[PDB]
């Protein structure tokens, strides 16, 4: 639905599929709330969502309630902002206080964003809600399209730097602020020195590397991880993409059970556009690419949904069933991405992860671990059993006091990482886990 | 509308056109009429106009230097090991060979989801009924009666279904990679529980089809016990997998597609196992030296709009290119039994014997070895995992460490 769906007389769930440009998180909550409509407006930033209040305040007359998890600022409007983490965090739709609820950015896979939407679906109508617009520029199965204010140029083998397979010539980076992708650390880190090497000022970013990129548009380029998150994101007069990325993968290795990992895959639609995206800002912008393809948009892996119970676990106070039934509601929810279901292993398992250490949660979530309860839960079987952590890693820090924990034989549940210690495989709740993917997994 | 025109120079078209083009019949027909001896490829199959099939082309050693203006590589979301070996030699050859147009045609381009079906009464599924069929449940009264088709990914899937229905007094057929005609061939109320191992150009003439929405494929995982693992993977199924299973109902009739799910995914990336089978594929049947191999599949890979894949180009030629001294013997008979990586069985199967040693398990795909009186060897020398490994394995074989290294290496 390429305009702003129109609000009914009964609850409905529309989908606004708009480019970009419309206002969806700004246009859109404006025009509703002109129509005397309450509208909550949620995406995954808190960048985005602190910065649509500013916005609307100049350019819409409008000054709106800006919820984030670090801010909360409360002026009494109709148009409400937030993150799906927020809304998530404040209970849920949970008063009959929103005609209007739209789910910016629909499109993204990552825990808070699916549990935040399949919340929002299943408690919408029943809170007293007529419309839920899932509003999205890439549409479930999107390929990338264009806007001629970016050239797109072939790399070939001929060049001066190699690149994944292909070569970038230096008349094309040299002189100028450009952006290189790259899917991993290392690979920024090799690629910069490379570049400096021949004379030029490359520049590696990622995760944990403190925002270094110059701002001065001198000549510069960048090579980065997509951790560079967009929004100053924009003069570079190019992009040079490596069209891949790392990706969080579960395996049902049948290790004890299953292992939380990575694979770097071509690149999906949206993250080719995000990073084609980057330059073309007002003046036109050159793409060079390794690989003319990716794989559409709308396909999230199951480790996601793993991660959604041990959200609801860790920082919801969701009971694995009722985590199942916000998640039901999303995967029966058509034109959103997709995942094998796996709903009924998940939350089995999680099920059975009774009586975990409360003050070893405290500190796995704190210290922003990507699963705060698996990890504190593992921490938990191995206390109780005198046992060290699987390895001795930053995630294991909960458990520094490896004085006691001696005894060898840590009670491996799963993995989550790499496993330096003896492991045994016959802890009850490991036991317990491999029956729940023999009653939930084939194979 | 039409095929693009004969261009001036050589170039790559894309006819993203359907059944509506008639690809294997007026798209082809066009361009002999206008005096071009035209070459059609497709999975399955004087005048100017060759129609053929990619394993065919491949056997035939590929493109002859002046022999077609135009290729259609028909199908060209086929992500089989053969197709894509295929195109990416016409892509490969098809200039220098002397053609002026090759154009890649699919009905099903990426991004492209299920089809606009004028005769097809499509429905949802409703969870009313105790066949429950993938979490929800299937109403009786729609199985009951007539001709049907319900797919389910799994032998065992459609095994049990079958029988809670037999049980229920439905005629259920169960149907996947075996024995046929268990449907009846003329005797109607018949419920056929297949696997996709029942192919298209069969057609049971049903009423109806049911879909379980998902599918099985094969994946490769990089496990590091010694190397990798030729396995499967359950994923939901996508636009291609839809369209030829909702395709095989009534064909004559209007008929009635029912579904679980209500996605799937407009086409997609096809798995590095398929890398292995064409360098397998090269080295066992076409004669093909791993380098010969990568340049035919680096010309599909730089070509825009086909299905993606990892570059694990320089991975795979370089561990084929290990792979020496096979035994000419067991490679002959790998090949005749059918086998999936016969390369790989063969290679396996080489270094058991020379190290006198039994094969990983004595499934039948190790039956070149039948001579285990002195390969009783406890331990085989784990080269890699193409199935279920029963017996005892040693990973010290130079050829493991060698693989393992090219995985350091090449894969990060
Ligand atoms: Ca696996
Ligand atoms: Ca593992």
Redesign the interface.
Known sequence: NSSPPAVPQSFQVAHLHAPTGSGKSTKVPAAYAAQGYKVLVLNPSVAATLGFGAYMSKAHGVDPNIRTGVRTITTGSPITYSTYGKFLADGGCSGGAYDIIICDECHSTDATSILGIGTVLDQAETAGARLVVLATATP????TVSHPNIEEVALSTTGEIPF??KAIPLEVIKGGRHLIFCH?K?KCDELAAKLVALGINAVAYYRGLDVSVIPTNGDVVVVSTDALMTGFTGDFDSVIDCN?CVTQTV?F?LDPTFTIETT???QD?VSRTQRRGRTGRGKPGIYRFV??????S??FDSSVLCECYDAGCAWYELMPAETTVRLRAY????G?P????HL?FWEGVFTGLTHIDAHFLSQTKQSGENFPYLVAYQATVCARAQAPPPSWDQMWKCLIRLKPTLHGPTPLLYRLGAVQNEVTLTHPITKYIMTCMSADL??
């Open positions: 479930p199965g999107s390929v994944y397979g991993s290392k891949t395996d290795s770097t895959l071509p639609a690989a003319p393809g990716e794989r559409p709308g396909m995967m029966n929810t058509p959103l997709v995942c094998q279901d009924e084939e194979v």
